[PDB]
Amino acid sequence: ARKGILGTKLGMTQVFDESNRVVPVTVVKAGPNVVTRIRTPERDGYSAVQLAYGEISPRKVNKPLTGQYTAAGVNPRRYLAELRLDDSDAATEYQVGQELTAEIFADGSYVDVTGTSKGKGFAGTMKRHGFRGQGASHGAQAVHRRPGSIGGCATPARVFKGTRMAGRMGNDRVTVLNLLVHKVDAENGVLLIKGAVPGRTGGLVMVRSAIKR
Amino acid sequence: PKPTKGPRLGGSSSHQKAILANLATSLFEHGRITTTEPKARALRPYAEKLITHAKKGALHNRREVLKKLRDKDVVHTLFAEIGPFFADRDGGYTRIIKIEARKGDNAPMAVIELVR
Amino acid sequence: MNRLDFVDKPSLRDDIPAFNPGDTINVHVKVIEGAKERLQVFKGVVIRRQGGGIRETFTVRKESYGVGVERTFPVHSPNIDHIEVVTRGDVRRAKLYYLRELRGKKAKIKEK
Amino acid sequence: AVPKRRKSRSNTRSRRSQWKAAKTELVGVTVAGHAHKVPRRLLKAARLGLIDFD
Amino acid sequence: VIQQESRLKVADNTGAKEILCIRVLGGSSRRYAGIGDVIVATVKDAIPGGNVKRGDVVKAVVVRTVKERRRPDGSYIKFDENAAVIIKPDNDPRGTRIFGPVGRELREKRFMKIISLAPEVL
RNA sequence: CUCGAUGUCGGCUCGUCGCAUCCUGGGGCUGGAGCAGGUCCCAAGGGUUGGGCUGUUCGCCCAUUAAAGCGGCACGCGAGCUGGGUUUAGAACGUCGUGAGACAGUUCGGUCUCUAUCCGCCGCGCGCGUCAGAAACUUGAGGAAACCUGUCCCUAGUACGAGAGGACCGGGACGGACGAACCUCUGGUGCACCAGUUGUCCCGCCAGGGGCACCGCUGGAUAGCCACGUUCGGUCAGGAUAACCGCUGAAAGCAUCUAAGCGGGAAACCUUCUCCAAGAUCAGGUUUCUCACCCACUUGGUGGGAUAAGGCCCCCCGCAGAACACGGGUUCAAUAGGUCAGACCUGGAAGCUCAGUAAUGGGUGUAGGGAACUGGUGCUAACCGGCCGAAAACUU
RNA sequence: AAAUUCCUUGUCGGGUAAGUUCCGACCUGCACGAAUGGCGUAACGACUUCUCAACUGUCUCAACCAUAGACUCGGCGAAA
RNA sequence: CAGGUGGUCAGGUAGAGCAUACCAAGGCGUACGAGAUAACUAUGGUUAAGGAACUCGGCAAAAUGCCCCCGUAACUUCGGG
Ligand SMILES: [Mg+2]
Ligand SMILES: [Mg+2]
Ligand SMILES: [Mg+2]
Ligand SMILES: [Mg+2]
Ligand SMILES: [Mg+2]
Ligand SMILES: [Mg+2]
Ligand SMILES: [Mg+2]
Ligand SMILES: [Mg+2]
Ligand SMILES: [Mg+2]
Ligand SMILES: [Mg+2]
Ligand SMILES: [Mg+2]
Ligand SMILES: [Mg+2]
Ligand SMILES: [Mg+2]
Ligand SMILES: [Mg+2]
Ligand SMILES: [Mg+2]
Ligand SMILES: [Mg+2]
Ligand SMILES: [Mg+2]
Ligand SMILES: [Mg+2]
Ligand SMILES: [Mg+2]
Ligand SMILES: [Mg+2]
Ligand SMILES: [Mg+2]
Ligand SMILES: [Mg+2]
Ligand SMILES: [Mg+2]
Ligand SMILES: [Mg+2]
Ligand SMILES: [Mg+2]
Ligand SMILES: [Mg+2]
Ligand SMILES: [Mg+2]
Ligand SMILES: [Mg+2]
Ligand SMILES: [Mg+2]
Ligand SMILES: [Mg+2]
Ligand SMILES: [Mg+2]
Ligand SMILES: [Mg+2]
Ligand SMILES: [Mg+2]
Ligand SMILES: [Mg+2]
Ligand SMILES: [Mg+2]
Ligand SMILES: [Mg+2]
Ligand SMILES: [Mg+2]
Ligand SMILES: [Mg+2]
Ligand SMILES: [Mg+2]
Ligand SMILES: [Mg+2]
Ligand SMILES: [Mg+2]
Ligand SMILES: [Mg+2]
Ligand SMILES: [Mg+2]
Ligand SMILES: [Mg+2]
Ligand SMILES: [Mg+2]
Ligand SMILES: [Mg+2]
Ligand SMILES: [Mg+2]
Ligand SMILES: [Mg+2]
Ligand SMILES: [Mg+2]
Ligand SMILES: [Mg+2]
Ligand SMILES: [Mg+2]
Ligand SMILES: [Mg+2]
Ligand SMILES: [Mg+2]
Ligand SMILES: [Mg+2]
Ligand SMILES: [Mg+2]
Ligand SMILES: [Mg+2]
Ligand SMILES: [Mg+2]
Ligand SMILES: [Mg+2]
Ligand SMILES: [Mg+2]
Ligand SMILES: [Mg+2]
Ligand SMILES: [Mg+2]
Ligand SMILES: [Mg+2]
Ligand SMILES: [Mg+2]
């Protein structure tokens, strides 16, 4: 009974609750969705449900992907992702063509939000893993942000696999756990989710109900 | 306009003001300038904001153009000829056409010009 | 207009007066001392606005007992009962941070 | 650092074969009744006489 | 925010005019002390003939901070000097009265005596 | 082994591993009433602070802490940094030497070179394979990361105890440190933003402006990037074991946790939670689209050509970025620019007029100027286009 | 207890919350001492050493911006 | 070839000045370019709260800075400081 929806992050704002405290929310347009495919265990090996989201022109979608929507009777959407269910009692409440909206979540419930983190480019070691660097004075020649040593000596004559180094950072699937739902606006299709939601302002966001509660 | 992301033209940030002022003096004088392509892309929002002050035509707009251009002969041809010629065109007063790159450094080149 | 204006619209407050930096202002703050819900008055010079609608703040500065205090309230906050403008001000800046280093007669904002 | 040993004929040809010029695409232009070939990024200036075809 | 070596002003009549932070009590390797945090400190300046002398290791609770503090309602409080009050080991001040205003963050940290002696609690 | 060179203490930076365990977790015994302990066994998952002195390692001291563990890795790490000490040349004191000079005796000064070929490692591509050519969603074989803990209240001043003192087990609230994501708030930055102002030159001059002086200096400062800021995380439930505790029960008419058989049992192990992952060559699964021609030869699972589905290149760009890749757009167009209007920053333009001998002040006017954020508008450039790309069979 | 003291961080006082260095003393001077000068000394020192006021990215603890490289394209084109 | 090379002339406006800033007469743009918000290095800039906690050591940076007028200690070789 793990519910889920696809959505678009719209930015952050603040709001005031009944105890006159300030709550930083992050607006997520949990938009209208549709099913388009049901993964049954006897046919596909697991239990899940696809979710299609986003307005798109019907000329921007190629013929292999258009026909996957014609088998379900749905107009083509932009995004398409799966909600992983448990290994039993697959689709007694999901049908093909069913419209899922934002009010499957209640006020005060918890959600787990997964998206793609923002990119930081080819980042050095003080930004990517949080090193310290050598000093800023007292003789330190040209090593103010350099990682220092990366290994031992003749034993072992190798850098170990998994040594933290510089490289790219961001564009990672990041799930943020146990976010409070302040308000679901069924008139606008908008969840007010307390806290931070990973992504640029407009990226794809999967909002699923929490398992840790 | 939109500031230059990354390093500026000609080295410093003060040379780029003088380059975009000299390239705007020469564009409004002749009507067509051959230059490098990253300078033609940078001239196109800068020079169209001076033509917008020409369409308004008041004294406060003339003082605002003289903050950038130092050639009074090209300020006069901007308010008596270039301004009223674009009196019925809502933006988009310039055009970039790409030219063959030049020998010696393979710098990509383009021409920037007024519309008609 | 912004993308998030249909969310802030039910949370805005009408009837908050027009005040600028340099204006001497009483602020009536809701205060909970246990279970009493009293009302405490803060009188001082508004020195700052940092706009944005629901996210707009303002900063008042008073001199309490030889010790300067600043408070940065949000506008449209339900812990402010009502704001009442006392004295209009005639300043030239908009952030007025030079008041953080003057004491006495040298920190007197004009009366226009 | 210096090279410790010289690279053999199979490692100095596998690297050197990857240093090569990329070819450009060419499209068709009929200006003044003479058909030529320019890249597509210069297709506008071919129709305006700004391209010297030598 | 107060870490080690921060010299604070003393806001009572015990005789000390200036203390100097040694630790920030309340956990291993704690870095910053806000309003209401207990400092083990040392007296670096004293009024002559006072109860306390120079070079005495005493405890003290911070009652003013120049750095802002986010209260849970969205508001902030900011002072123009850092101030402390030298205390007994049962959260009562050693002096008999307190100078200057103190913060309301002393109220939820069970420092009830310093509030009732303060000129103005904000 | 190394003298046709294996650069030596300590510190910084980054680690990794053993358990002879400092803390937390599980137990037996006790000269264990309780609270605290002593001692032994099991356990390496995480944590193990900041200062004074000294070149120091070590050590003493200060204030804390749940605790301030011991060790290996060329006493880890100088083609990563330092250079205080030892260990060149100068000089001095003490001592020894008739003297040149000497001293694990002291003191002051004393060049730390290098563009990464190969393995290793951290990232990102190009090619081919995966028995037709493509596109979208995926299972997880197997890996990675994470794993810390305190104070207070209730249970209860109950059990225990002459008293002082003071719980196990269960339940709840709030913190320290640490990590990730984000930019609403606070705060930092701001090199095409706004304003004040000094020297000087220039725009013919006055007015108004600009060039240069670190962005000339100074007060602000939206976006973006940030942390000192905000939000969340290490949870709960299972499986198989350690020490240890058992039940049934002989060989051994008794007894014994054991030889047959069965239980309880922890931060360790394995699932659970987050992430990567079919180059997992056993190269996987469910679906959808094209599902088609022509030529020559030595008639071959042969060579070419031309196409469908489809993608790439070029073009307009991006909060995606070293190149490359990735994401959005290409007139059936709001993709960047312009433009119009908001939001937001600055703080009251120029011109005119009024008041003053003047510097300057009031009015016209929430003015003028202006970048990133939001919506409208078909004005400018997204073109009148090139290059790749689809099948032998056969056996049961 | 020294530019001289091995034992040694001698002992006592001062300064610091904490002082093997520093200052003042004692004398048990391993191994001070009178022109290879003894003990002082105002002024002076890019000298050695210790404390304090002020100020600071030296540090807690790092963030951001511009520029010269690094990087990409075209030309020339080495070295150990 | 970012080094070295004796003498003469030496304008304006601010300034004590042959300093410094901007200019005259007169020279010059000095011989690889074009781009592009990577890490890292280099030369500069700014920084919340704390202010030597850094470190062998306040190394480096920051700070002080000019003219006029009041004011100025121990000690001394009577000049000074
Ligand atoms: Mg970026
Ligand atoms: Mg650092
Ligand atoms: Mg160097
Ligand atoms: Mg350096
Ligand atoms: Mg920028
Ligand atoms: Mg360059
Ligand atoms: Mg400048
Ligand atoms: Mg505002
Ligand atoms: Mg050799
Ligand atoms: Mg025991
Ligand atoms: Mg063991
Ligand atoms: Mg360990
Ligand atoms: Mg585990
Ligand atoms: Mg000290
Ligand atoms: Mg170790
Ligand atoms: Mg070693
Ligand atoms: Mg070691
Ligand atoms: Mg070393
Ligand atoms: Mg080495
Ligand atoms: Mg002799
Ligand atoms: Mg020797
Ligand atoms: Mg030495
Ligand atoms: Mg040197
Ligand atoms: Mg697995
Ligand atoms: Mg992070
Ligand atoms: Mg914002
Ligand atoms: Mg801010
Ligand atoms: Mg400007
Ligand atoms: Mg003038
Ligand atoms: Mg000039
Ligand atoms: Mg900002
Ligand atoms: Mg268990
Ligand atoms: Mg996956
Ligand atoms: Mg493998
Ligand atoms: Mg496959
Ligand atoms: Mg594309
Ligand atoms: Mg606008
Ligand atoms: Mg006015
Ligand atoms: Mg008059
Ligand atoms: Mg001694
Ligand atoms: Mg002495
Ligand atoms: Mg004699
Ligand atoms: Mg003699
Ligand atoms: Mg002598
Ligand atoms: Mg001398
Ligand atoms: Mg090249
Ligand atoms: Mg020369
Ligand atoms: Mg000479
Ligand atoms: Mg002169
Ligand atoms: Mg000069
Ligand atoms: Mg000059
Ligand atoms: Mg030359
Ligand atoms: Mg750069
Ligand atoms: Mg600072
Ligand atoms: Mg400050
Ligand atoms: Mg200070
Ligand atoms: Mg100091
Ligand atoms: Mg350090
Ligand atoms: Mg230290
Ligand atoms: Mg120190
Ligand atoms: Mg110095
Ligand atoms: Mg300086
Ligand atoms: Mg003196």
Side-chain angles (χ1 to χ4, degrees):
Chain A
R2 181 168 167 84
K3 296 179 290 295
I5 208 72
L6 280 171
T8 301
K9 174 177 175 180
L10 294 176
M12 294 183 72
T13 185
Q14 67 181 2
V15 77
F16 296 102
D17 59 353
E18 292 87 4
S19 66
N20 295 322
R21 290 196 294 267
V22 59
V23 175
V25 297
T26 300
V27 172
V28 173
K29 185 174 74 175
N33 290 332
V34 70
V35 168
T36 315
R37 196 70 188 274
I38 293 170
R39 304 293 190 188
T40 61
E42 60 92 19
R43 184 184 294 275
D44 299 332
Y46 61 95
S47 175
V49 48
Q50 282 192 355
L51 291 175
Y53 171 67
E55 183 68 29
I56 198 166
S57 179
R59 69 185 183 274
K60 294 180 183 179
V61 174
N62 53 6
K63 289 176 95 289
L65 184 58
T66 299
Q68 290 183 356
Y69 287 99
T70 305
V74 182
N75 286 318
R77 299 286 195 270
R78 185 181 295 276
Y79 300 101
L80 189 58
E82 286 186 354
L83 174 63
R84 180 65 177 273
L85 298 174
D86 55 355
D87 54 355
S88 65
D89 192 76
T92 61
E93 71 272 16
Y94 291 104
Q95 294 178 357
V96 173
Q98 179 176 359
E99 193 75 28
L100 290 176
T101 59
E103 62 264 15
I104 62 173
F105 298 98
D107 290 331
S109 296
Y110 287 95
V111 290
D112 293 335
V113 169
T114 174
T116 303
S117 69
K118 292 171 72 175
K120 305 297 185 291
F122 195 87
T125 60
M126 295 181 73
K127 184 174 178 178
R128 189 188 178 187
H129 302 290
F131 287 182
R132 296 183 179 94
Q134 284 77 10
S137 181
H138 294 283
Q141 179 175 0
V143 288
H144 304 291
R145 298 180 67 87
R146 285 177 71 190
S149 179
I150 60 172
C153 195
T155 303
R158 70 190 184 100
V159 173
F160 288 105
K161 186 183 290 185
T163 297
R164 301 167 80 190
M165 282 175 180
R168 281 159 66 111
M169 181 185 176
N171 288 314
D172 289 331
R173 181 180 173 89
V174 174
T175 300
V176 178
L177 294 175
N178 287 320
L179 296 175
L180 183 65
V181 175
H182 183 75
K183 179 177 173 65
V184 48
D185 192 0
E187 183 68 28
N188 292 317
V190 166
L191 267 64
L192 292 175
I193 296 171
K194 174 182 174 183
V197 165
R200 60 185 176 91
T201 307
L204 184 64
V205 164
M206 185 75 204
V207 175
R208 296 176 295 175
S209 67
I211 41 177
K212 289 186 177 181
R213 298 290 180 89
Chain B
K2 187 73 172 293
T4 298
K5 180 169 88 270
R8 272 71 174 176
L9 301 175
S12 67
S13 67
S14 68
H15 193 189
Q16 198 192 9
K17 297 195 269 78
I19 288 171
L20 293 175
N22 289 319
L23 288 171
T25 303
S26 296
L27 176 64
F28 293 152
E29 184 177 2
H30 303 92
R32 183 186 290 265
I33 293 301
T34 299
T35 184
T36 67
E37 184 179 0
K39 293 183 177 74
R41 298 283 172 83
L43 186 62
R44 188 163 70 94
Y46 181 84
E48 291 185 357
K49 286 184 177 292
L50 295 177
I51 300 169
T52 301
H53 294 294
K55 286 172 65 175
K56 292 180 173 67
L59 180 64
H60 184 263
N61 302 115
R62 192 181 289 262
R63 304 285 181 90
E64 192 71 28
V65 173
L66 292 175
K67 286 184 178 181
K68 300 180 183 295
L69 300 175
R70 267 78 57 82
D71 196 1
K72 288 185 183 294
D73 291 330
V74 79
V75 173
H76 170 70
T77 62
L78 186 61
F79 289 2
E81 295 178 354
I82 298 170
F85 184 71
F86 292 113
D88 55 354
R89 186 184 291 272
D90 292 330
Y93 311 115
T94 51
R95 177 185 291 119
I96 296 174
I97 304 299
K98 297 180 180 184
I99 313 298
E100 183 182 4
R102 67 186 184 180
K103 192 182 291 185
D105 57 354
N106 201 9
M109 302 291 286
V111 293
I112 182 166
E113 69 268 15
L114 304 176
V115 172
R116 290 176 180 176
Chain C
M1 61 184 72
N2 298 118
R3 187 184 289 114
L4 298 177
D5 285 333
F6 66 96
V7 178
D8 302 335
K9 192 261 187 295
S11 179
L12 295 176
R13 290 181 66 190
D14 54 354
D15 291 331
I16 298 169
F19 57 93
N20 289 318
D23 296 335
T24 303
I25 289 293
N26 288 320
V27 179
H28 294 280
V29 187
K30 292 180 180 180
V31 171
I32 300 172
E33 291 178 353
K36 295 299 290 183
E37 187 69 27
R38 61 183 290 265
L39 196 67
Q40 187 179 3
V41 182
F42 196 87
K43 179 178 171 67
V45 179
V46 167
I47 64 173
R48 187 175 70 187
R49 302 287 292 269
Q50 292 181 355
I54 200 65
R55 63 193 67 87
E56 179 175 2
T57 64
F58 69 98
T59 298
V60 282
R61 177 179 172 88
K62 75 186 291 291
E63 189 73 26
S64 179
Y65 286 87
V67 169
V69 181
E70 291 182 355
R71 293 293 306 275
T72 305
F73 297 99
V75 196
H76 311 281
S77 177
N79 281 315
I80 293 170
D81 198 0
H82 59 95
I83 295 171
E84 192 269 332
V85 185
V86 173
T87 298
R88 299 289 181 183
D90 185 75
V91 297
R92 299 290 299 278
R93 303 288 167 266
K95 300 282 111 166
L96 295 176
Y97 290 154
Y98 64 95
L99 277 76
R100 287 180 180 175
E101 57 94 23
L102 298 174
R103 283 91 171 94
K105 298 293 188 291
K106 293 182 184 293
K108 183 63 66 67
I109 294 95
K110 286 173 93 288
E111 193 69 24
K112 295 293 188 291
Chain D
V2 304
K4 182 69 176 176
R5 293 173 181 94
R6 65 179 288 174
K7 291 177 75 69
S8 68
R9 293 178 61 88
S10 180
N11 289 319
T12 190
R13 268 74 165 174
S14 296
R15 186 190 65 238
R16 186 172 290 170
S17 65
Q18 296 295 318
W19 178 72
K20 57 188 176 179
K23 67 176 291 184
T24 183
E25 297 294 327
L26 275 296
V27 298
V29 165
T30 304
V31 292
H34 296 286
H36 295 90
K37 293 287 185 66
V38 297
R40 183 179 165 88
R41 69 185 300 274
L42 299 177
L43 187 66
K44 290 289 287 184
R47 293 175 178 174
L48 299 177
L50 293 171
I51 296 299
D52 194 2
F53 296 103
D54 288 333
Chain E
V1 292
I2 300 301
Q3 71 253 17
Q4 182 184 358
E5 296 285 324
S6 297
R7 291 177 189 262
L8 282 80
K9 192 261 190 295
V10 185
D12 56 0
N13 55 3
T14 60
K17 293 192 293 294
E18 189 178 4
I19 58 171
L20 186 147
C21 175
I22 291 169
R23 283 292 94 204
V24 178
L25 295 175
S28 177
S29 71
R30 187 174 180 180
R31 286 184 288 120
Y32 298 117
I35 290 173
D37 289 330
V38 172
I39 294 300
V40 179
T42 174
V43 178
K44 302 294 284 183
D45 195 1
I47 200 67
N51 195 3
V52 298
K53 302 294 186 291
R54 290 180 63 248
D56 292 333
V57 179
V58 293
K59 293 181 188 291
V61 57
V62 179
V63 298
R64 290 192 289 269
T65 304
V66 182
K67 182 67 178 174
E68 299 89 4
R69 295 291 296 162
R70 180 183 174 91
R71 291 184 178 180
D73 57 353
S75 64
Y76 294 87
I77 187 165
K78 183 177 185 295
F79 294 94
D80 286 333
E81 67 180 3
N82 293 314
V85 173
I86 295 172
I87 59 171
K88 292 182 173 69
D90 57 353
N91 293 324
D92 289 330
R94 189 178 293 178
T96 57
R97 65 174 183 171
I98 306 300
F99 297 111
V102 301
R104 193 168 295 278
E105 290 86 5
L106 295 176
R107 191 169 181 87
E108 70 268 15
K109 297 294 184 183
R110 73 275 298 155
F111 285 97
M112 286 293 108
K113 187 67 182 296
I114 304 169
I115 286 173
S116 65
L117 296 176
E120 185 182 2
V121 175
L122 282 86

